[PDB]
Amino acid sequence: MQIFVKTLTGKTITLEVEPSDTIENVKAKIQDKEGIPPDQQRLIFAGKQLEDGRTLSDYNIQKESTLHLVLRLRG
Amino acid sequence: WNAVALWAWDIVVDNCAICRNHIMDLCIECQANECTVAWGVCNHAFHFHCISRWLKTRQVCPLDNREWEFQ
Amino acid sequence: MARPLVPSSQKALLLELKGLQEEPVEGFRVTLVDEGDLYNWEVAIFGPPNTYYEGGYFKARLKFPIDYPYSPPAFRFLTKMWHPNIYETGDVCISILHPPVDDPQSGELPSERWNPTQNVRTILLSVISLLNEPNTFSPA
Amino acid sequence: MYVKLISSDGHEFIVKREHALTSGTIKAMLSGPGQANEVNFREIPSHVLSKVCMYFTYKVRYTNSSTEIPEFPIAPEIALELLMAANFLDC
Amino acid sequence: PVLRSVNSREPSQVIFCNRSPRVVLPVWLNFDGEPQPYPTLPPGTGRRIHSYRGHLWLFRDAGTHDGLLVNQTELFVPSLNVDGQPIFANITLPVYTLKERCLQVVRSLVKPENYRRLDIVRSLYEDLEDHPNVQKDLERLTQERIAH
Amino acid sequence: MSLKPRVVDFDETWNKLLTTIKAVVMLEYVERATWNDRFSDIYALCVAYPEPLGERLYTETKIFLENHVRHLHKRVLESEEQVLVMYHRYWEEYSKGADYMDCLYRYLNTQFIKKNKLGGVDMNEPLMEIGELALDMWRKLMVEPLQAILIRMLLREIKNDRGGEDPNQKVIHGVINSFVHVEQYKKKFPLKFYQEIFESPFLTETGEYYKQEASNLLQESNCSQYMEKVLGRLKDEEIRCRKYLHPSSYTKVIHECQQRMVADHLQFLHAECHNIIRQEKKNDMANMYVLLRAVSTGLPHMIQELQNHIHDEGLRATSNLTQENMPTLFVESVLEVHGKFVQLINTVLNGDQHFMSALDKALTSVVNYRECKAPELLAKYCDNLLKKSAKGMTENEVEDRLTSFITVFKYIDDKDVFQKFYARMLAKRLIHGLSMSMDSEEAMINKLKQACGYEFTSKLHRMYTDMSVSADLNNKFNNFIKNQLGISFQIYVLQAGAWPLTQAPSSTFAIPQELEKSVQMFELFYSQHFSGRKLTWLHYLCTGEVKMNYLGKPYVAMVTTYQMAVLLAFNNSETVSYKELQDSTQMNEKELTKTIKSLLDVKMINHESSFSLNMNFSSKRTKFKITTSMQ
Amino acid sequence: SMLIKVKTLTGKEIEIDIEPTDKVERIKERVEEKEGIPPQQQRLIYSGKQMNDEKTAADYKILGGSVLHLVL
Amino acid sequence: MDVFLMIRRHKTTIFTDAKESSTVFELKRIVEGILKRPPDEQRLYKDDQLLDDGKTLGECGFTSQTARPQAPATVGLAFRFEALCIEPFSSPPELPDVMK
Amino acid sequence: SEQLKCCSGILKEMFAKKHAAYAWPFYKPVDVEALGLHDYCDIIKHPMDMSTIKRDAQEFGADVRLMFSNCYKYNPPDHEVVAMARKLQDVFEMRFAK
């Protein structure tokens, strides 16, 4: 499938992944496509944090959707 | 004859994060009137005028958490 | 008649507002409280579906410093909120809104700290994420 | 426009009715039938009616404005009679 | 009470100048609304005072408590100041009804108890006896504020 | 002077004042001297010595008023059938009185009633200053007793007025306003006696009577006449209310009539709204609008019906069209529908924004109609307007047509397909020169941008900027060459993301010697003057000058690069076969076939096939250019 | 005459056509005419400001293609 | 600068006002409004000497000091011709024995 | 020169609106007549104020310390003025140390 990814640099990109790829794999692909290490990457969809240890099917994200990438946050 | 050959390709826009302007276009501050483009260790492209201010405010790249250094 | 010189911070704020309007961000809307004040913007926060805040409407006030984007703007929720990372006055404790000052004792990385590369949309997304995943390490 | 009050000894006191209408009882005496000018009476001596008229004039001239608004002196001798007359005229 | 000094803790400076021939003792309303006395000011005598922003103060006559008009209103509210210059409040007299003014003259010229010594009816004896209490004025002001 | 304390024979003094006040209250002339003498005696009574008789004066005046108003009630009863007029007379009497006899007792008010008003354990009636006492007792002993009879007769009088009669307006208004005068001097409520004792009965009965009248009109005449007579009734009712009632109830009475003549029959009105609008009966449409505006639930249904009619009319007018001029006929039908119904709404429906919105929705549905066909036709129409084929039209006419096209396109829902057609149309117009006016194209682009943001126009804006940039770069290259190839320079470079005809070639095409030299010079100039993304040579569009010296007269044509190579291939021999030409040109088979066909059509060349140069080829002018027929 | 889309929480972009001088009440009623949401249970959000039922759409600086926020 | 006056004849008395710079003719016009005998019939004095129309009240001795609102001055009256004559008011009462 | 510039910057920061919530009482010298403090002059033998302050940075530091100490000694320990003075002095000491 294909998804939409937005980086902090304003430019927009898309990634071709299946419903079997893991969150870690998606983060690695985003890092390869942009130039940000996975440690300082965070994917947000529908106002919810994307756990690294999961799969796209877990959040039920289909093709043509959008994913928001932000920096590291804490309390 | 006219013929056609165009664009002499040579490799993204590398939009600066601090100013949000184009690489070819001068920085936001320089627009109001020699704005060189400075690249960091992570290869991120940032204008010299905004890169110097960011470094002065804090010695950390805006996108990556690593140090800012040229080639 | 030369037009008044647009400040760099004002131009950056206008560009950010234009980008946000051209690319709507789900879960919130950003608009200026007063047309003549580009440093005072009103943002509406809507609870994401499938969360404890679903169906909620909490207003927030964003104030951008004169040195923007060098310094992160002040973000505080207008509607009364009870969260470990939200103070009674409405201030939001987020590493993104913290100044880029190297604080070894804080435990927050400079990369997670506020940077010029950050944006209002990114700050709103981080706040929304924290609303559902509050950090109890340093409750405010 | 001018009402002609009257005292005991026979004095006739003429004054603008717009001033004289600050006293409720004179306003009543004028608002009745007949026309109600001339307004006669039973007690007041001229020496009390004169002071009441001076109060009427003062109440328009040197008050209701930005100013010092001085005290209009009242002789201690006339105090009782003028108090009773002010009670009657409701001024 | 509805009329009470605001405990904002914000410094405020003022001056209460007496324009009426009477001696005026500035009155201060406390945090709960209870009147609080202040040192008297001689007729034509004025000075500076210290009071936080939002304070509610009134005026009174030195001997008879006869009402005095401060800044063309029953109460004066001092705001914050600029450059340390105290606010300027002017005390001036109201427009007395003749009964009330002659009553005030009788009270000034005859001591507070000697009213029944005078040669008129006991109804106006009763009027004489009423030295205006600040409580009645405060209640009337609260009612007027509620109505308006 | 004033009035002195006195010992007073209360009985005789009160008897004298009693007869005197009697004389004045009954309107009997009384001298001002005597009246002020009564004032005198009243001061005395209220200051009486040794003790004040003010209390007994008040009690005796209360008894006097009770006696008097009871007298007047007995008099009204005795009046039998003249109650309205005689009540009005007594009311004028007693109101003027209790205005006078208030000022006269005003001293007593101040001294006694204002000073003792409250208290006592028993819930006794509070003291009332003389004005309040007089009016309240008038109430309590003339109105409350008769309230039913007065209501009945006043209702009957107003009913006569409705039936065409004209009873005494002054008397009726006075009798209806005394119920509100008796309200004066009490702070509790301003109008409650009148509201709850007249307005409510009168509103009930007027509602009943006009519901009956609505039944009569409906059963008697048709829908149009019914609306007209209902509007007439409402107007006459407003006049009647103004004449008779208190102003606070005008709204309530008119609301009652509207509710009982329109709202409680809205189903028939809605059912016939279909017929009225579908029959474009303008007068009844206006009446229906005015009446249904008075009911919240009315206007939405008429909005729906006008929406449906506009939808159907547009659909019919646009589908019944001939296929000869589909774009122009489509757009003209849409605009004529729009104008007709905008004029109709402004003229007859008061220009209501709701019906304007209905018109907009209906025309949106029509302009997105399909079996998309409508965006296709609209794109074709704007294209045709801008092309050179619109012969005879001036620049102002083109601008007006563009404004109309924008007005029609504002409701185009299929923006994606519209832009898809428009990008190709505009690009073809620009590249081949078919565009009638580049300034007009820029104006249309600006209108589209103002309509739908820069994102929507990105493609067309980029295409126009690219045409301008190609022209500017050609000028700059000419300047650079002059600042230092056998033929001029005219070639195209485009971005593949907007231009739809960007079918870049890939075969090892061999450009002529002059074309190759010019390309080398242009590339050398560009390498130092600019940089960026790479693009393939769009030889299929570029045109250049080729000289045919073999003809009997000189002729030079600015022809396509592929066409130029094909023509130059003839330099080897007069007759050339397809295989030899393909080998010489190195061009794609489809491109070579298209070039051969275009050359045959132009008459330049004549027909495993073989072709020979046309020695009879001629042109209108010695110097000319060939059109890009390689789209 | 303008074209706007009312984005719902799920993600369905409801396209509606309004006038430059339209009213908030009419804009809300349009959603019910095409979405079914009653006008009494709609709270439009635009530029972080709660849409008022009295102010016209021109006071909110609404332009073509603007995404509107509707919360039930 | 205003001047207030207590015009008088016999034991009758009147209350009006004026400006210091006002002419005696203007004051006679005021008396015409009062009486209402027109100015020509009037004949005015202060204290006993006849006034002149052209003279301003300031010239005649009226001043904001001499004719203050609480103590309005006195003007004489006579008509066209007859002499002047003024008499005082009634004597006030006696102070009661308690205030003595 | 550097010490004087740093002292001027610290004074400007103190006078800024950022800390005006607590620096307001010390903007100008205390007005004895307005405050009604008969013994204020006897209590404080050397009055000072931020406006009055506005050899080296040591002199400025000593003046600021004396100004703070005057109010600290005059007012009771639990005074709102004392609390505001302490709040301002915290930032002043932080700036001096930095």
Ligand SMILES: Cc1ncsc1-c1ccc(CNC(=O)[C@@H]2C[C@@H](O)CN2C(=O)[C@@H](NC(=O)COCCOCCOCCNC(=O)C[C@@H]2N=C(c3ccc(Cl)cc3)c3c(sc(C)c3C)-n3c(C)nnc32)C(C)(C)C)cc1
């Ligand atoms: C002579 C006169 N004639 C007609 S009126 C009058 C008069 C007018 C004003 C005053 C003084 N002002 C007041 O009493 C004001 C008026 C009214 O607004 C209420 N009020 C108060 O002071 C009230 N106070 C407040 O609302 C704030 O409460 C904190 C309580 O402490 C107030 C003062 O303590 C009593 C006497 N001590 C001082 O004044 C010491 C003085 N305090 C302060 C001081 C006082 C309070 C605060 Cl929060 C901070 C600093 C002070 C300074 S300098 C300066 C500009 C100030 C304000 N200061 C320094 C340095 N060192 N000492 C001081 C009250 C009734 C609770 C005492 C005295 C007489």
Ligand SMILES: [Zn+2]
């Ligand atoms: Zn970097």
Ligand SMILES: [Zn+2]
């Ligand atoms: Zn930059």
Ligand SMILES: [Zn+2]
């Ligand atoms: Zn720069």
